[PDB]
Amino acid sequence: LHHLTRFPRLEFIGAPTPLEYLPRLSDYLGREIYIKRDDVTPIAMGGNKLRKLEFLVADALREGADTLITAGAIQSNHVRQTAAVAAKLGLHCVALLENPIGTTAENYLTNGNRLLLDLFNTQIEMCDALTDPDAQLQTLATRIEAQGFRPYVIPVGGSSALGAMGYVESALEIAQQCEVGLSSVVVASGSAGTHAGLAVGLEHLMPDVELIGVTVSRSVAEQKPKVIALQQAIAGQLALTATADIHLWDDYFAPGYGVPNDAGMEAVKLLASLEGVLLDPVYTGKAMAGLIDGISQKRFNDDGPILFIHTGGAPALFAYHPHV
Amino acid sequence: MPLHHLTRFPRLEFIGAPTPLEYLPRLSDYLGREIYIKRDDVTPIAMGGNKLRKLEFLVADALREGADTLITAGAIQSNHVRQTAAVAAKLGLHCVALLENPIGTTAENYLTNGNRLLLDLFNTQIEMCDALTDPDAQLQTLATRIEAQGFRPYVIPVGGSSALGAMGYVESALEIAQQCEEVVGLSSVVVASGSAGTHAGLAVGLEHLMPDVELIGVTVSRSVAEQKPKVIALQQAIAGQLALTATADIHLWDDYFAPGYGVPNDAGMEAVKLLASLEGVLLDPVYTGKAMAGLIDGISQKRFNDDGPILFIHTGGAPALFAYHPHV
């Protein structure tokens, strides 16, 4: 795994993020539950996207870029973290945003992550839909370049093979921190970089552990090709083999990306009330709902300890309140 | 060596490792002065903040007493209440909160979003009152009612600001001294001064570890005349508990909080926008935005002892941004 040091990398996090036992949640579910606190990173309310940006933005600087361009929903955590990093480094930031849920709710449209974008002086470009994100970002990049800037394009969710190296890094922390008998790891699976990064790292570091991605936007059939593709791409770049099966549960995100559901919201309440831990309605709440039902349906490989990867997202709580 | 009596006070571990102390190169470039930041806003519990350091001592005391319930008070958008509630949930303690609306707003996000929203997630029992006219007395009346239900209550004062709670910031000063060692020779430290525990704890710690550093408290709710005896009372009580003397004068600037506690002002807003746009750092309209506006003006007016490096204590507060939006 030494090839990770060959990639340029900025230091946004520093020390490994905490890995904690959750004794009250464990007592309630009758199962040992641990949490990787990737929500606690120091930049602009934190999250998983920061691990990716350590690599992506290092690349951006290597190319001498002065502008970061990315895309996501109005309430995207990735756009928020990209914009914070841009501000920190004196780079301009252009965000291509969509309204994925057709809401006119004031807090969704203007509060939460979207509010922070304004504080970070993000240039906002609206679009009807992100039907072809890569191509749409490329078009915007040319226009911004025509204005006299030197743009660097960061893909949706920061999920490229390079971005996903942040989660190979996270896997190293996990492996060091777990040295008890961990059986399963649960993570939200969205743009797939987090899932795929963890997949490559955990195959080599903790081969006996089962990694489960809980989809937040797509069926198993649509999502599996995406995760596998990144997995193979990451593996090649690190000069590793990656043969582990990708596991995905798609039962926990209906009626679609960015729409809260009851199981998800109840998971948010459960973690807040038992552990003082804040999840979110779009990602971690749905992923935790998956973990809980996995216990209910005896869906994991065995009865042993489960590690939940907290990827962040809590600023969305304030955007989604009171509804829509 | 000098702060060794801190050992005798029981404490829970909520923070873990020392919080980051960071240079702010873009802010420093703009202000023409070396600016560092102590990131007490980045702690692991429910969006972080200064109040957590106090809770390490207060809640340890509660557990030693056999208490199963935490009672405290503050504004609807109190960070202290939010952090207290989060710790209570984590430890399986009941939490009861006496809340007031200090600004008389009817704005829906102030009333129900931000910190207030999180209170419901932590299952806090919420008690409204017209105003916290006598917080200590009102807390005791509530404690009596709660005790009558069979609960074993532990009353935490507004802001967590008792001599015991303030030990959290004596501890913070130890981190600061260690982090600055052979790295930076600080001239000044700036912190928001509210219920006064943070200011007072830092005052005691810094007098002993870094006596030549100038500690500036920027008031968020009171004039220098009203605030200073509160800080001094705590400073002296903290020193006593540690078998130390504290002879340092307390310094406060009160020019930066008008028109009052919990009301945003223009300079505060501009300080929030400055830190966000230059450093990707999130301040808040009630506390840190106002303290930072003080730091900035202090530089502009040459209010500090000299032209040397300034450390800003980031005490947190950012969830209030979502409560104050779009207006109050």
Numbering used by the authors:
A (entry chain B): 3 to 181, 184 to 328
B (entry chain A): 1 to 328
Authors' text:
D-cysteine (D-Cys) moieties are found in firefly luciferin, semisynthetic cephalosporin MT141 and malformin A. D-cysteine desulfhydrase (DCyD) is suggested to take part in the catabolic degradation of D-Cys and D-Cys-containing toxic compounds. StDCyD is specific for D-Cys and βCDA, and shows no activity with ACC, although it shares significant sequence identity with ACCDs.
D-Ser, although analogous to D-Cys, is a poor substrate. Hence, the structures of StDCyD cocrystallized with D- and L-Ser were determined. In these structures, electron density was observed near the active site into which the respective ligand could be fitted. However, the internal aldimine was not disrupted. Presence of non-covalently attached D- and L-Ser at the active site of the structures of these complexes suggests that the formation of external aldimine might be the slowest step in the catalytic reaction for these two substrates. The proton at the Cα of D-Ser is oriented towards the hydroxyl of Tyr287. This is consistent with the observation that Y287F is completely inactive. D- and L-Ser bind non-covalently at the active of StDCyD without forming external aldimines.
